[PDB]
Each structure stands twice: as structure tokens, then as C-alpha cells.
């Protein structure tokens, strides 16, 4: 064991979602929000 | 950690502008105009790998017709007569014998006439 020979367990290091970074990533442009609503706006949504 | 985009961005524009050489005007000098041109040239090349097989069969057929009508038979009757004689040579080879060996082509026509008779 050395400082450059340790690795984590498989399945514990899921990567986060990054929106709006091109066509190929699957989340570009609208970034998962759809088209033209109150829910698509910055800060938008209704109270509980 | 601040990240600067200069070195990566420059190498990515040079890749597109090298695929676009020989084009006219801004289509080989300007990135915005040249990127569209490279995209359209790939669309055309995909389509023309299909049309290439169509344009060559159409050319072989027109040369077999010309060489058959000179031996007293048409393309339609020649092709039907070879199927009844069990001759499996294809269009590409037939249009090559017709140009470079006219003695062997006549032998094929006499075999198709005999089958039809």
C-alpha cells in the first residue's frame, strides 16, 4: 500500500449532473426543463 | 482554480479549418462559415455512398444493351436467355467483356439464343 495505490469501492463515486454543455451530453440547451413555462424560469414554481 | 480556454479552443478551430481547404472565399478562412460547410460535405458523402452503387449498375446495363443490339438481340431477351441457360455471370463482368473481348461476347449471345429457341 502506497499513497498512489488506494482506490474506492465500486459504485460509491457517482458523478454529478452538468447541464447545458453541448448536444452529445444529453442535457444541452434547455437543460431538462422543457419549453416556455412558469416552471422553466429562474426561481419558478408553486408553493407546497 | 481558474481555468483558461485559450489553448484548447485554438486547437479545436484549427481542426475544422483544415478539413475545409480548397473551398471558395470565406468557406476556407472563417470558422463560422467553414463549420457549416464541413457539416454539409459529410451529409452529401453519406448519401453518395448509396447512389454510387446505382450509377454504376445503370452504366453497365446501357453498355450491354448497345453490344447486344449489334448481335441482333435486345437487353431484355439477352438477360432472360442467360437465366434459362444457367449462366451466372453478372452485369459488371459482362460490360467488361463487351469492351475488351468481342469474340467471347458473341459466344455468350449464341448461347442465350439457343436457350430461348
Amino acid at each position: 500500500m502506497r499513497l498512489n495505490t488506494l482506490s474506492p469501492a465500486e459504485g460509491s463515486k457517482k458523478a454529478g449532473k452538468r447541464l447545458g454543455r453541448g448536444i452529445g451530453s444529453g442535457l444541452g440547451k434547455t437543460g431538462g426543463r422543457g419549453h416556455k413555462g412558469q416552471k422553466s424560469r429562474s426561481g419558478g414554481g408553486v408553493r407546497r | 482554480a481558474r481555468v483558461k480556454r485559450g489553448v484548447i479552443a485554438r486547437a479545436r478551430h484549427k481542426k475544422i479549418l483544415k478539413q475545409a481547404k480548397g473551398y471558395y472565399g470565406a468557406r476556407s478562412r472563417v470558422y463560422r462559415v467553414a463549420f457549416q460547410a464541413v457539416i454539409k460535405a459529410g451529409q452529401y458523402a453519406y448519401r453518395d455512398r448509396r447512389q454510387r452503387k446505382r450509377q454504376f449498375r445503370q452504366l453497365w446495363i446501357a453498355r450491354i444493351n448497345a453490344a447486344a443490339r449489334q448481335n441482333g438481340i435486345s437487353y431484355s431477351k439477352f438477360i432472360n436467355g442467360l437465366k434459362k441457360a444457367s449462366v451466372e455471370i453478372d452485369r459488371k463482368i459482362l460490360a467488361d467483356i463487351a469492351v475488351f473481348d468481342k469474340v467471347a461476347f458473341t459466344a455468350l449471345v449464341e448461347k442465350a439464343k439457343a436457350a430461348l429457341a
Binding site: M1, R2, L3, L6, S7, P8, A9, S12 | -
Partner: protein, 201 residues
């Protein structure tokens, strides 16, 4: 278990559950990563659009001039404007469970024994606080990169090792997981071995 001794060919008895375990790599990685996170300072910041100098005047009127609409000179789209998601000072430390921190120590110590990187002696000291004196002793035992764990702190052993960057001195109460891995060889006196088992148990 049973640990041999190099300077006196004796035998010393230790616990199996502290020196005979198998290596839990996933557990060790978590504790080592949390150690280096606890070393950070976190001192930095930038300025948002509300912290840049300048007034709140609208640069030009809303309609009629033929330009895109503007509302502030401190906009994060303009040159010399704010940073959209500016940073603040923050704390990067993580929590480690007590039983998890102690379990990772026992598998590090258990693996040093398998690879022959741990050696036990009765005594280890020098007469005077001289660097030349300690350097000579290490060369006789054929050691270059080494970590020395001693039962009780020594004034002369601490001073003689200060100017050698490849040699480090501790006591039993001051062990950390990262320096047990980073050093080529580990030297522990008999007194140190006794206290380490007691604090681990």
C-alpha cells in the same frame, strides 16, 4: 501474534485482532481522504455584482437607441463586472466515525507486518543532540527513510532528527494514518507497542 526482535532476538507477544487482520482497502481510502481534507485553509473570495464599485445608474435608456438593453455596469456579462457565482471562505473538513477511524488503523498496522515494513527494538536513543550522531546509527542498521515511534518523548532524539527531512519522530499518542503509509520503514520500541494496543484494543 509474535514479533521477533532484531537487536536482542527475543520474542514479544501482541494481539491477533490488532496485527493479524486482512486489508480493508475501501475503509482505509475513506479515512486517508478525510485526513487531507482536514488540512485545507479555505481562505479566498471574489466579488459579486453587488460588491463591485460603481453606481446604480442605467447606462442608457430602455428603448430607441438601437442597442441591446442594459441595466447595470456591474453585470457579469460586461468586462470589469461581477463574478456570477463568486466564492466565499468555507470549511472542507469531514466527519469520521470513531469505530471507523480505529478500524482503519488496525488494518494499516496489520499490513505493515505482512510486507516486513515494521521492526521492533527495545531501546532507541543517542547521547547528545547531534545530527551527525543519529545519522551514523541509522546507517549501521541500514535505514534511509524511516518513521520512529517511541514510548516517551526524548529531547535529544527530537533535536537530532530535525534537520533530516527523510526521518521523522513521534510518540505513541501522536500517530496518524497518513504518515504510517508514507514512510518506507517503521521502527517501534517495545514500550510504544504496548501503548498502541491499549489505545486500540
Amino acid at each position: 501474534m509474535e514479533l521477533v526482535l532484531k537487536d536482542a532476538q527475543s520474542a514479544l507477544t501482541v494481539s491477533e485482532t490488532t496485527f493479524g487482520r486482512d486489508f480493508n482497502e475501501a475503509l482505509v481510502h475513506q479515512v486517508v481522504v478525510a485526513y487531507a481534507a482536514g488540512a485545507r485553509q479555505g481562505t479566498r473570495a471574489q466579488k459579486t455584482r453587488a460588491e463591485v464599485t460603481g453606481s446604480g445608474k442605467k447606462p442608457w435608456r430602455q428603448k430607441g437607441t438601437g442597442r441591446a438593453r442594459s441595466g447595470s455596469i456591474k453585470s457579469p456579462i460586461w468586462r470589469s463586472g461581477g463574478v456570477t457565482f463568486a466564492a466565499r471562505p468555507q470549511d472542507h473538513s469531514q466527519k469520521v466515525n470513531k469505530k471507523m477511524y480505529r478500524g482503519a488503523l488496525k488494518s494499516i498496522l496489520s499490513e505493515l507486518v505482512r510486507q516486513d515494513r515494521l521492526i521492533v527494538v527495545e531501546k532507541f536513543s543517542v547521547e547528545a543532540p547531534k545530527t551527525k550522531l543519529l545519522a551514523q546509527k541509522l546507517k549501521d542498521m541500514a535505514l534511509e527513510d524511516v518513521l520512529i515511534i517511541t514510548g516517551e518523548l526524548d529531547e535529544n532524539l527530537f533535536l537530532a532528527a530535525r534537520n533530516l527531512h527523510k526521518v521523522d519522530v513521534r510518540d505513541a499518542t501522536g500517530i496518524d494514518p497518513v504518515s504510517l503509509i508514507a514512510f518506507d520503514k517503521v521502527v517501534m520500541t517495545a514500550d510504544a507497542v504496548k501503548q498502541v494496543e491499549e489505545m486500540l484494543a
